[PDB]
């Protein structure tokens, strides 16, 4: 038994002496809330930390940060021994000194700038011989214990004096640098990063297991994403956290060699990593190495591609090397590389969402000190087209602005800077706004994927439609047991038709938010570009991106916008079928029905929609969104007024009754006009900060009905023709 | 404190001995409109100029032209020391001669063509050892002081006689050529040029600051524009 062995895993808190344990873990080992333990690992070394309460990690695993993982020489997946230590122990004299690998540039006091704001009111239990890292001064510097009283009996106390000599010492090869790349340095990638964690955990941490079994290990991992997403960061972090010898192979570095030298350089890079097993061979750019799809210009290019292909599939076990290649675009790769044995496991790393970029900002700003009025929530929202490298550049530029506001008048003309100035240099929002306005996003044209923040509370009315949407996309994904028993497959998608500006997009986004799945949206111009550009082959890429991002919903806005541009029911001498809808149907028919992917079709002119899409099998479920009723319009305003401060004066119920033929869009622009009037009257009166009732009274003058009465009749007759519930309404069984 | 340190910046006027200062800058240092100062920089050298009134530059910076920046061996972003000099000082005999790097092609009188239309009705305070540049004759030729009365006490006066030998002298590597490319030689580019000024001011003027910090410096700047816009001019001027 020996219930003291726990699985080491990454922590969540950014502190130093923190251990995250579940309630039953301390309840089994008679451990309390505010106690200390003694973690013991390999190489005859121990560590003293503080246990904390957790409820998310696991049942029998320990969450330990990178700062303390390097102290015990224990990586992820290894096992350690934990035991309580209720013995009283105080600190008297702690002597520490940093290592010269990171102190080059520090001048002045070292206690007041790094130790005082870290050791006081913390009661961090230090251990003689441990390496702890502290952050501050827009950098990261650690410290090393060289001589102290024999451990245990080392706990920082307010009445403990600290003195240091001043010169640093050199480190050894036993410990790794804390400034390197780790799992805690990656943000905005959780679904993709977890797959890579679980994919290479066995062959790297346990190389001897695969040598004794017939299981084929994954020999190739291809990474996607626009340049700057962080593929190299993830590749280096996996190697640095799994104990594998990382070997970086740059793209242009090999191609820059002469004729025949590139072959030797690429070939010598494989057995070198094979000897240092386990190892990970990473390729920076692979589209620039093997673009053997359309280029095929030059014998040396083909020779390099063939050499790479030969060295790729020729890894018949031997070592335990895993090759992870990175590229920019999936189609820009040689198809011969995707053969089974060279590159079979495929990983697509997308642009982080709003909740992902905040983690990147927290990672990139953890070394510097910010002011109280600095919030990263608005920065992530305002930066919705940027990538991982974009935000690091934004942070660097924002940090540079603060230096410019103090270097000019202080004029520290010294060979090295002091640590007592940079700590006080707090970056404010004004520094970030200057850099945000000039940073050009590198990721704007390709489709962005989210899991939208809009929920059911933002949608007013449409209660009949909500239950229907929560009936076909949430039941097969949560309770499939009642589906395979009947032997019938679920629906492939549902089409939305009705008057424009009623919520055709809000329902699709809310159903994605509730189901916790990705959301891909295609607008009208996006569909029209591939028609006018005479290139309909881009549907396959959209469907592939949706498939491997499962679960996800495939939303097509105004699907009839391609038939409206060429007439409609009659139009020109052609019919109601074109190349883009052709390719969409072709890719939907061959789409995997067992996957969690879903397709949402939105249209405002259902009379011109091709019937070929509407058969049972592609899009059979049709839900009509009518104009909001009296109590449906009230909820629209109750949901739209949650952002702007409006007092109790404005009567929303009375406004809904007068707005009879008003769609959802008109009620939004009414509030927009009222708030614009409020802003204008505030600015004009500045030469008050609340929305009054006469604002809406004047804004109601220009209340234009976007939907007239002529199309209402057409929509209603179309709905009743497609429903056809008459005749069989009184159909009953005799006995 | 020591309120005598000012930030050196480019000037606006195309004159020679002109210092642009704000009203509070002279109001703090008890300096008037028509007075002279003594600018001191690095390498144990000084410079005498005339302060002027300005209202646009800054609160605590000094605007100094390229002609006087090379005299003190001070570039943009550096700091200097300014102090008033109300002592009376007149000129008696100023001996100057140009450098052969730019005089190849000049023949005849040198005073009437370059010094007379520059020194008269100007009262420019010269300093022994300074290199001042004058424009004229569809070119630019400067002059060098080789031997004169020990500075101070060098101010051009109408009753001051000037004679010159005629042969020039060679320059050294301490000073830079005034015919080179500078910030004053770029025109029509203010928004773009300011971004490049502020982008590389830190890593170039203070190389040791980035070596002691984790901030990533900009390693690459791409320039656009149709051929002939002046990208090479800006690139050479920044360096
Ligand atoms: N998801 C991320 N989390 C944290 N940092 C990131 C992320 N993505 C990129 N970065 C930062 O951007 C910098 C540049 O990354 P880069 O080498 O361009 O990645 P790639 O090689 O995948 O394009 C790195 O130093 C890294 O710190
Ligand atoms: N039922 C509704 N409840 C609340 N707001 C709505 C509703 N329908 C539309 N809106 C608002 O109208 C705006 C535009 O909607 P739009 O995308 O044109 O709808 P559709 O896709 O049905 O045409 C959205 O920002 C949304 O906030
Ligand atoms: N904005 C400018 N201000 C002053 N001179 C300019 C400017 N742009 C170009 N010139 C002049 O034009 C000449 C040729 O410039 P050129 O070398 O063609 O620039 P680039 O290499 O950027 O095309 C230079 O000698 C320079 O003096």
CSV table of N, CA, C and O and ligand atoms in Angstrom, one decimal, chain A residues 458 460 500-506 636 640 668, ligand 2:
chain,number,residue,atom,x,y,z
A,458,UNK,N,-29.1,36.7,-22.9
A,458,UNK,CA,-29.0,37.8,-23.9
A,458,UNK,C,-30.0,37.7,-25.0
A,458,UNK,O,-30.3,38.8,-25.7
A,460,UNK,N,-33.8,37.7,-26.2
A,460,UNK,CA,-35.1,38.0,-25.7
A,460,UNK,C,-36.2,37.2,-26.4
A,460,UNK,O,-36.3,37.2,-27.6
A,500,UNK,N,-35.1,39.1,-41.7
A,500,UNK,CA,-33.8,39.4,-41.2
A,500,UNK,C,-33.8,40.2,-39.9
A,500,UNK,O,-34.8,40.8,-39.5
A,501,UNK,N,-32.7,40.1,-39.1
A,501,UNK,CA,-32.6,40.8,-37.9
A,501,UNK,C,-33.6,40.3,-36.8
A,501,UNK,O,-34.2,41.1,-36.1
A,502,UNK,N,-33.7,39.0,-36.6
A,502,UNK,CA,-34.5,38.4,-35.6
A,502,UNK,C,-33.8,37.6,-34.6
A,502,UNK,O,-34.4,37.2,-33.6
A,503,UNK,N,-32.5,37.2,-34.9
A,503,UNK,CA,-31.7,36.5,-34.0
A,503,UNK,C,-31.2,35.2,-34.6
A,503,UNK,O,-30.8,34.2,-33.8
A,504,UNK,N,-31.1,35.1,-35.9
A,504,UNK,CA,-30.6,33.9,-36.6
A,504,UNK,C,-29.1,33.6,-36.1
A,504,UNK,O,-28.7,32.4,-36.1
A,505,UNK,N,-28.4,34.6,-35.8
A,505,UNK,CA,-27.0,34.4,-35.3
A,505,UNK,C,-26.9,34.2,-33.8
A,505,UNK,O,-26.1,33.5,-33.3
A,506,UNK,N,-27.8,34.9,-33.0
A,506,UNK,CA,-27.8,34.8,-31.6
A,506,UNK,C,-28.1,33.4,-31.1
A,506,UNK,O,-27.5,32.9,-30.2
A,636,UNK,N,-36.2,41.5,-25.0
A,636,UNK,CA,-35.1,42.0,-25.9
A,636,UNK,C,-34.5,43.2,-25.3
A,636,UNK,O,-33.3,43.4,-25.2
A,640,UNK,N,-30.8,44.0,-23.7
A,640,UNK,CA,-30.0,45.0,-24.3
A,640,UNK,C,-29.6,46.1,-23.4
A,640,UNK,O,-28.7,46.9,-23.8
A,668,UNK,N,-32.5,47.3,-31.3
A,668,UNK,CA,-31.1,47.6,-31.0
A,668,UNK,C,-30.7,49.0,-31.5
A,668,UNK,O,-30.0,49.7,-30.7
C,2,LIG,N1,-34.2,38.0,-30.3
C,2,LIG,C1,-33.3,38.9,-30.0
C,2,LIG,N2,-33.1,39.3,-28.7
C,2,LIG,C2,-32.2,40.3,-28.4
C,2,LIG,N3,-31.4,40.9,-29.4
C,2,LIG,C3,-31.5,40.6,-30.7
C,2,LIG,C4,-32.5,39.6,-31.1
C,2,LIG,N4,-32.4,39.5,-32.4
C,2,LIG,C5,-31.5,40.3,-32.8
C,2,LIG,N5,-30.9,41.0,-31.8
C,2,LIG,C6,-29.8,42.0,-31.9
C,2,LIG,O1,-29.8,42.5,-33.2
C,2,LIG,C7,-28.4,42.6,-33.6
C,2,LIG,C8,-28.2,42.1,-35.1
C,2,LIG,O2,-28.8,40.8,-35.2
C,2,LIG,P1,-28.6,40.0,-36.6
C,2,LIG,O3,-27.3,39.3,-36.6
C,2,LIG,O4,-29.0,40.9,-37.7
C,2,LIG,O5,-29.8,38.9,-36.5
C,2,LIG,P2,-30.1,37.9,-37.7
C,2,LIG,O6,-28.8,37.0,-37.7
C,2,LIG,O7,-31.3,37.1,-37.2
C,2,LIG,O8,-30.3,38.7,-38.9
C,2,LIG,C9,-27.6,41.7,-32.7
C,2,LIG,O9,-26.5,42.5,-32.2
C,2,LIG,C10,-28.5,41.4,-31.5
C,2,LIG,O10,-28.0,41.9,-30.3
